Amino acid sequence: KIFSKCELARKLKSMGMDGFHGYSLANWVCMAEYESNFNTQAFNGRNSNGSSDYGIFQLNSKWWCKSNSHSSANACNIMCSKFLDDNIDDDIACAKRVVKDPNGMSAWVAWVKHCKGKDLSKYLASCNL
């Protein structure tokens, strides 16, 4: 599924993300835009390592989930394969956990590159939320 910005924004808002760990809704939606272009099937292989990044939040299989050929820490206790599904509840539960690490949202490189430096005050202004 490719979400639209505002549709993603509604889903994340409904699931307690707005302000989650000090990160505003706009920040979370911007991270998804730049990580995966809002696509639940996004998949980015080998990479820097061996590992891969899965789903709308491009969660890596060395740290966050378990994959086929690439063994894992599995901090989200889940098979990477679930993050390629259309439903994003698992992905959200895992992103909630990722951001709890010391690097915060800087775990997501595309957020650091495309969001962190930006004025996002108007990013969700077209949205009916």
Side-chain angles (χ1 to χ4, degrees), residues 54 59-61 64-68 70 72 74 76-85 90-91:
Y54 292 87
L59 302 164
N60 189 260
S61 66
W64 303 108
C65 56
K66 191 194 313 142
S67 207
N68 241 58
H70 12 311
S72 190
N74 198 17
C76 288
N77 308 283
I78 198 170
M79 296 299 107
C80 297
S81 131
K82 276 247 255 157
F83 290 151
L84 295 185
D85 293 350
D90 290 333
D91 303 70

mmCIF file of all heavy atoms in Angstrom, residues 54 59-61 64-68 70 72 74 76-85 90-91:
data_model
loop_
_atom_site.group_PDB
_atom_site.id
_atom_site.type_symbol
_atom_site.label_atom_id
_atom_site.label_comp_id
_atom_site.label_asym_id
_atom_site.label_seq_id
_atom_site.Cartn_x
_atom_site.Cartn_y
_atom_site.Cartn_z
ATOM 1 N N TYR A 54 13.202 -2.813 5.806
ATOM 2 C CA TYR A 54 11.871 -3.246 5.363
ATOM 3 C C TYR A 54 10.717 -2.235 5.684
ATOM 4 O O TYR A 54 10.734 -1.636 6.760
ATOM 5 C CB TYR A 54 11.560 -4.545 6.079
ATOM 6 C CG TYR A 54 12.424 -5.735 5.673
ATOM 7 C CD1 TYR A 54 13.633 -5.982 6.270
ATOM 8 C CD2 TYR A 54 11.896 -6.704 4.780
ATOM 9 C CE1 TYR A 54 14.383 -7.133 5.919
ATOM 10 C CE2 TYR A 54 12.648 -7.817 4.363
ATOM 11 C CZ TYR A 54 13.857 -8.041 4.964
ATOM 12 O OH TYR A 54 14.572 -9.103 4.552
ATOM 13 N N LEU A 59 12.803 -0.444 8.440
ATOM 14 C CA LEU A 59 13.389 -1.043 9.651
ATOM 15 C C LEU A 59 14.393 -2.186 9.278
ATOM 16 O O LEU A 59 14.039 -3.123 8.516
ATOM 17 C CB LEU A 59 12.245 -1.516 10.575
ATOM 18 C CG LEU A 59 11.234 -0.378 10.992
ATOM 19 C CD1 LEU A 59 9.967 -1.046 11.544
ATOM 20 C CD2 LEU A 59 11.769 0.634 11.996
ATOM 21 N N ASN A 60 15.615 -2.070 9.826
ATOM 22 C CA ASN A 60 16.756 -2.915 9.465
ATOM 23 C C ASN A 60 16.737 -4.270 10.229
ATOM 24 O O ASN A 60 16.438 -4.325 11.488
ATOM 25 C CB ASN A 60 18.062 -2.181 9.790
ATOM 26 C CG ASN A 60 19.346 -2.889 9.240
ATOM 27 O OD1 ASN A 60 20.054 -3.603 10.019
ATOM 28 N ND2 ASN A 60 19.725 -2.606 7.939
ATOM 29 N N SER A 61 17.167 -5.305 9.509
ATOM 30 C CA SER A 61 17.077 -6.690 9.967
ATOM 31 C C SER A 61 18.328 -7.188 10.740
ATOM 32 O O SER A 61 18.461 -8.373 11.025
ATOM 33 C CB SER A 61 16.902 -7.556 8.741
ATOM 34 O OG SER A 61 18.046 -7.533 7.913
ATOM 35 N N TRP A 64 16.407 -4.834 14.324
ATOM 36 C CA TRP A 64 15.004 -4.659 14.711
ATOM 37 C C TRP A 64 14.153 -5.829 14.460
ATOM 38 O O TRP A 64 13.187 -6.030 15.127
ATOM 39 C CB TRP A 64 14.389 -3.401 14.026
ATOM 40 C CG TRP A 64 15.197 -2.237 14.389
ATOM 41 C CD1 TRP A 64 16.057 -1.547 13.581
ATOM 42 C CD2 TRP A 64 15.382 -1.713 15.693
ATOM 43 N NE1 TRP A 64 16.714 -0.582 14.305
ATOM 44 C CE2 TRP A 64 16.298 -0.639 15.597
ATOM 45 C CE3 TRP A 64 14.831 -2.006 16.917
ATOM 46 C CZ2 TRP A 64 16.668 0.159 16.685
ATOM 47 C CZ3 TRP A 64 15.168 -1.182 18.008
ATOM 48 C CH2 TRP A 64 16.101 -0.147 17.892
ATOM 49 N N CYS A 65 14.495 -6.632 13.489
ATOM 50 C CA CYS A 65 13.650 -7.753 13.141
ATOM 51 C C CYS A 65 14.526 -8.908 12.632
ATOM 52 O O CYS A 65 15.741 -8.737 12.479
ATOM 53 C CB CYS A 65 12.595 -7.333 12.129
ATOM 54 S SG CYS A 65 13.265 -6.591 10.588
ATOM 55 N N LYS A 66 13.924 -10.077 12.458
ATOM 56 C CA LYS A 66 14.676 -11.284 12.027
ATOM 57 C C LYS A 66 14.397 -11.607 10.568
ATOM 58 O O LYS A 66 13.238 -11.639 10.143
ATOM 59 C CB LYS A 66 14.360 -12.517 12.897
ATOM 60 C CG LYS A 66 15.329 -13.746 12.672
ATOM 61 C CD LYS A 66 14.787 -15.108 13.306
ATOM 62 C CE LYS A 66 14.253 -14.983 14.778
ATOM 63 N NZ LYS A 66 13.009 -15.855 15.028
ATOM 64 N N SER A 67 15.472 -11.832 9.814
ATOM 65 C CA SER A 67 15.384 -12.187 8.403
ATOM 66 C C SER A 67 16.105 -13.475 8.058
ATOM 67 O O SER A 67 16.724 -14.095 8.914
ATOM 68 C CB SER A 67 15.984 -11.095 7.535
ATOM 69 O OG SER A 67 15.364 -11.132 6.270
ATOM 70 N N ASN A 68 16.039 -13.818 6.773
ATOM 71 C CA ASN A 68 16.311 -15.175 6.255
ATOM 72 C C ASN A 68 17.809 -15.483 6.399
ATOM 73 O O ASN A 68 18.209 -16.388 7.166
ATOM 74 C CB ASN A 68 15.856 -15.299 4.758
ATOM 75 C CG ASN A 68 14.736 -16.398 4.531
ATOM 76 O OD1 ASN A 68 13.652 -16.334 5.144
ATOM 77 N ND2 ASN A 68 15.017 -17.388 3.650
ATOM 78 N N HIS A 70 20.251 -13.069 7.004
ATOM 79 C CA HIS A 70 20.900 -12.064 7.830
ATOM 80 C C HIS A 70 20.402 -12.295 9.298
ATOM 81 O O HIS A 70 19.295 -11.883 9.623
ATOM 82 C CB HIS A 70 20.673 -10.576 7.295
ATOM 83 C CG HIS A 70 19.615 -10.379 6.202
ATOM 84 N ND1 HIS A 70 19.535 -11.139 5.049
ATOM 85 C CD2 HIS A 70 18.637 -9.438 6.070
ATOM 86 C CE1 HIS A 70 18.523 -10.715 4.299
ATOM 87 N NE2 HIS A 70 17.962 -9.683 4.894
ATOM 88 N N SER A 72 19.938 -11.796 13.529
ATOM 89 C CA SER A 72 19.492 -10.505 14.155
ATOM 90 C C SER A 72 19.308 -10.329 15.691
ATOM 91 O O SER A 72 18.780 -11.178 16.335
ATOM 92 C CB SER A 72 18.144 -10.089 13.517
ATOM 93 O OG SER A 72 17.781 -8.764 13.884
ATOM 94 N N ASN A 74 16.893 -8.587 16.801
ATOM 95 C CA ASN A 74 15.449 -8.744 16.855
ATOM 96 C C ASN A 74 14.729 -7.993 18.009
ATOM 97 O O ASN A 74 13.782 -8.515 18.588
ATOM 98 C CB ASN A 74 15.094 -10.221 16.894
ATOM 99 C CG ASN A 74 13.654 -10.476 16.522
ATOM 100 O OD1 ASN A 74 13.001 -9.621 15.937
ATOM 101 N ND2 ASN A 74 13.137 -11.659 16.886
ATOM 102 N N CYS A 76 12.502 -5.893 18.021
ATOM 103 C CA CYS A 76 11.058 -5.731 17.851
ATOM 104 C C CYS A 76 10.331 -7.066 17.899
ATOM 105 O O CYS A 76 9.125 -7.115 17.803
ATOM 106 C CB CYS A 76 10.731 -4.889 16.570
ATOM 107 S SG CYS A 76 11.158 -3.138 16.796
ATOM 108 N N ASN A 77 11.087 -8.161 18.003
ATOM 109 C CA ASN A 77 10.557 -9.561 18.090
ATOM 110 C C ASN A 77 9.561 -9.960 17.047
ATOM 111 O O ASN A 77 8.384 -10.284 17.301
ATOM 112 C CB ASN A 77 9.940 -9.812 19.453
ATOM 113 C CG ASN A 77 10.859 -9.464 20.552
ATOM 114 O OD1 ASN A 77 11.785 -10.216 20.855
ATOM 115 N ND2 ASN A 77 10.633 -8.283 21.155
ATOM 116 N N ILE A 78 10.043 -9.946 15.838
ATOM 117 C CA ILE A 78 9.194 -10.045 14.734
ATOM 118 C C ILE A 78 9.983 -10.417 13.510
ATOM 119 O O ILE A 78 11.141 -10.032 13.375
ATOM 120 C CB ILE A 78 8.405 -8.686 14.539
ATOM 121 C CG1 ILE A 78 7.215 -8.947 13.656
ATOM 122 C CG2 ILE A 78 9.324 -7.556 13.962
ATOM 123 C CD1 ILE A 78 6.273 -7.754 13.619
ATOM 124 N N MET A 79 9.340 -11.096 12.601
ATOM 125 C CA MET A 79 9.991 -11.454 11.345
ATOM 126 C C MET A 79 9.845 -10.238 10.423
ATOM 127 O O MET A 79 8.737 -9.699 10.241
ATOM 128 C CB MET A 79 9.322 -12.639 10.708
ATOM 129 C CG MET A 79 9.436 -13.914 11.578
ATOM 130 S SD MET A 79 11.193 -14.341 11.799
ATOM 131 C CE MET A 79 11.379 -13.909 13.389
ATOM 132 N N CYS A 80 10.971 -9.750 9.954
ATOM 133 C CA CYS A 80 10.964 -8.672 8.949
ATOM 134 C C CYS A 80 9.900 -8.687 7.890
ATOM 135 O O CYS A 80 9.387 -7.631 7.482
ATOM 136 C CB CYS A 80 12.300 -8.657 8.269
ATOM 137 S SG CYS A 80 13.621 -8.292 9.345
ATOM 138 N N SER A 81 9.584 -9.879 7.410
ATOM 139 C CA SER A 81 8.504 -10.146 6.499
ATOM 140 C C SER A 81 7.192 -9.465 6.912
ATOM 141 O O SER A 81 6.409 -9.014 6.036
ATOM 142 C CB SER A 81 8.357 -11.706 6.337
ATOM 143 O OG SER A 81 7.037 -12.212 6.481
ATOM 144 N N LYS A 82 6.944 -9.261 8.210
ATOM 145 C CA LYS A 82 5.611 -8.652 8.553
ATOM 146 C C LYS A 82 5.483 -7.150 8.149
ATOM 147 O O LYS A 82 4.377 -6.592 7.973
ATOM 148 C CB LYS A 82 5.276 -8.815 10.008
ATOM 149 C CG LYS A 82 4.630 -10.209 10.345
ATOM 150 C CD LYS A 82 3.168 -10.097 10.784
ATOM 151 C CE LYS A 82 2.928 -10.299 12.369
ATOM 152 N NZ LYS A 82 1.650 -9.702 12.982
ATOM 153 N N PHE A 83 6.628 -6.531 7.990
ATOM 154 C CA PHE A 83 6.715 -5.103 7.723
ATOM 155 C C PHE A 83 6.480 -4.837 6.274
ATOM 156 O O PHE A 83 6.422 -3.683 5.877
ATOM 157 C CB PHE A 83 8.122 -4.580 8.086
ATOM 158 C CG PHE A 83 8.406 -4.564 9.577
ATOM 159 C CD1 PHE A 83 9.746 -4.730 10.032
ATOM 160 C CD2 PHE A 83 7.394 -4.370 10.488
ATOM 161 C CE1 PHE A 83 10.029 -4.788 11.381
ATOM 162 C CE2 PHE A 83 7.651 -4.389 11.822
ATOM 163 C CZ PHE A 83 8.941 -4.584 12.315
ATOM 164 N N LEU A 84 6.348 -5.892 5.456
ATOM 165 C CA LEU A 84 6.005 -5.705 4.041
ATOM 166 C C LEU A 84 4.512 -5.874 3.767
ATOM 167 O O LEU A 84 4.079 -5.757 2.626
ATOM 168 C CB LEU A 84 6.845 -6.640 3.152
ATOM 169 C CG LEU A 84 8.366 -6.422 3.112
ATOM 170 C CD1 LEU A 84 8.876 -7.421 2.067
ATOM 171 C CD2 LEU A 84 8.889 -5.006 2.751
ATOM 172 N N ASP A 85 3.728 -6.007 4.821
ATOM 173 C CA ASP A 85 2.284 -6.158 4.774
ATOM 174 C C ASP A 85 1.664 -4.777 4.693
ATOM 175 O O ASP A 85 2.302 -3.810 5.005
ATOM 176 C CB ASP A 85 1.750 -6.770 6.069
ATOM 177 C CG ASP A 85 2.174 -8.194 6.275
ATOM 178 O OD1 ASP A 85 2.751 -8.849 5.347
ATOM 179 O OD2 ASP A 85 1.937 -8.754 7.384
ATOM 180 N N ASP A 90 2.289 -3.141 13.172
ATOM 181 C CA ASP A 90 3.546 -3.770 13.714
ATOM 182 C C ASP A 90 4.683 -2.779 13.532
ATOM 183 O O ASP A 90 5.540 -2.581 14.432
ATOM 184 C CB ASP A 90 4.046 -5.017 12.957
ATOM 185 C CG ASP A 90 3.181 -6.232 13.135
ATOM 186 O OD1 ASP A 90 2.511 -6.319 14.189
ATOM 187 O OD2 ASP A 90 3.137 -7.113 12.213
ATOM 188 N N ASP A 91 4.719 -2.213 12.339
ATOM 189 C CA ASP A 91 5.738 -1.198 12.012
ATOM 190 C C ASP A 91 5.734 -0.043 13.063
ATOM 191 O O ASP A 91 6.775 0.437 13.514
ATOM 192 C CB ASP A 91 5.442 -0.570 10.597
ATOM 193 C CG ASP A 91 5.385 -1.593 9.484
ATOM 194 O OD1 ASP A 91 4.438 -2.418 9.394
ATOM 195 O OD2 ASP A 91 6.252 -1.694 8.589
#
